[PDB]
Amino acid sequence: GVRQYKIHTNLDGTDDKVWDVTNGKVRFYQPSNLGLQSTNNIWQSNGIGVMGTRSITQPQIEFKLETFGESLEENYQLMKDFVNDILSKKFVTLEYQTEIFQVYADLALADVTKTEGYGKNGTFSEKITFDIITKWYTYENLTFDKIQNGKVIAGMSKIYGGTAPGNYKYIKGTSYTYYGESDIDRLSRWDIKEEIFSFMGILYPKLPKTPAGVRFLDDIGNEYTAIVFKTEQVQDYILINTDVNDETYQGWKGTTALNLFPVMDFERYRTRIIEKGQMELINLSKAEFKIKRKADFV
Amino acid sequence: YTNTSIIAGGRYFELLNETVALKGDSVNYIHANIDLTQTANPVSLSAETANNSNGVDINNGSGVLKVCFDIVTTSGTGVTSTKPIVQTSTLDSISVNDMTVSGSI
Amino acid sequence: MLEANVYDNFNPNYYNISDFSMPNGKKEKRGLPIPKARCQVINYELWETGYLYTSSATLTVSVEVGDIVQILFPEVVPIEEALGKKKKLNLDMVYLVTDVDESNKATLKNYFWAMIESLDVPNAITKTTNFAIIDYLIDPNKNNLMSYGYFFNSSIFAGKATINRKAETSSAHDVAKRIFSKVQFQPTTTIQHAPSETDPRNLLFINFASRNWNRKRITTRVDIKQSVTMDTETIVDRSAYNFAVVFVKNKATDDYTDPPKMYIAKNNGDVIDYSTYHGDGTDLPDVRTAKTLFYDRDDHGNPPELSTIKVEISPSTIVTRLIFNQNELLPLYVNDLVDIWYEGKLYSGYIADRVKTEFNDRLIFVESGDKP
């Protein structure tokens, strides 16, 4: 029904800590602006209007930080905790949730205020300003699609049936349609329908010393970028994060974490921006993907 | 180090699948660091720029003992060559029957 | 902040004298003094070699023009001075104060380039190996600033010295730049106490050594996120008007009465007469840069050689420079041979400079060229 705001220390990560700024002890109220400012570069010559390129500018969100605590000790402990937790990580992801959507914004602490105007049992009523890194993006699960063989029908499918030594008839419209393909289980498509900007993939390699990773193809079947690694031993999994702010390319074997950046193929990795098409798995047995895609206004 | 046993300053310890990070296109000097004050974990490993062996008497006095055991030469991608540190056997008098030398006396 | 040691000018008119009595009894050169004031370098842009820009930093103590500033870092750099011999050297950034403003912001010039100042070198010295030029340039008997020793990697400066244009007298700055471009190396000045424990002197040395005696080539990628600055440099000086309207003076008239002969340079590198061309334009340049040349007939009377015209219309070394943030996933230090991938294109060269600022850590990449 009502909206939900949730501050995350590290989303997409094991060391995550979530603060409910809607229901918890420390709450965010009356956001300054959730919209957007656009600058279209319009120049008018003799009454006729010419439009350039629109630079969608995102403005600082200023909240109304309010703590609810049983004692003065409790609210001072809340301010020291919530702020340090935002300061501890270089950037904090604010989740925007409503009946219809679940968007996210990457924020950086711009300004926080601490004053001595306490209410009852020493309760804070302050202004918390944030700088916009990326405004509104959808964090969703990306999975491959499987292809299944069509059913075999007498007269419709290509088979030599009925009276010996078989018969298939050329009709008009119904004629002969191939049932499927021998070993249809080989075909798998990791479909990309809209342009994505960053992702958190968990890749499980097959063979050691053979380049292992992912490659991306466009609408015409041409490779534009590829994250691939040539390791000496089989890693249990290669944890990759394409996020610009905290780029991670690490391999895991047992309880040991290895940085795989120098072993990576630098020539194939041309871009981070993934375009409309499909994704292929190079020397991978299994893969788990989480795709984050931007939305200007939500 | 899958399974490597080391006796540094007369102190025995085993390295069981202990991985140590290296510097790209550099000659890494792997050291065995012993700090007796760190009662929970006295032995720690470190890949360094140069052979920073101190020779601190940890058994009689205080301090942190540093001693190089392996020299790992690396490239931009991985490891090129590995040369281990010599094991010095300081003795007073030898009463031996036979000997085979691979280098020089 | 960083720690800074401020000393008065290392005057070679004072420090070059070998009157200091060593503990054994021997008479050696005067050692460097103690800092007149220990301060802290703040609001800084500090380069490692000073390849392109001059350093600038505000200092707590009121330093004056001439003073030497030694910026300290709690880390160590291992230089390979001999095939197997590697020495423990402390990280230092040594500069000369060139000018201080009202707000005490000092303009710092890297010690080496401030040492080889106003020094001129004739073609005669440049005829030998690169070692002979380095041994000439680094001398406390000649230089404006005091020098004690030089560390140099024999393999990198082993090659024959680059050929000088017109065989003229060049400045120590121009020759060093020409040499450092071909050898793909940059110098670093370092203050460190004498190697022998008996010698108690603090000394200043110039570094031409690397972490690897036999330097290896690295392969890396530079992403657009690292605030990359692309600009084109020129290593070798060659002329810019690819087309030449060449005039030859008539012997009988002692005038330029005869019509001109036009010469065009092909994409391959060869120079042909424009009239002789029979192609489709694919082998010719995309833009025609032209100049009018006047030549005087030789004593023999023959027209000037095609090859002599060719040198004047020949192309210059178009080189790409990349300035970007330090990647902690694959760190790139000064004096390292690298192969950088940027926006789908491969650029090959070395890391010339490094800026140590309050906000970022950046590198200057110089594409050495010599691609085909």
Ligand SMILES: [Sr+2]
């Ligand atoms: Sr993260």
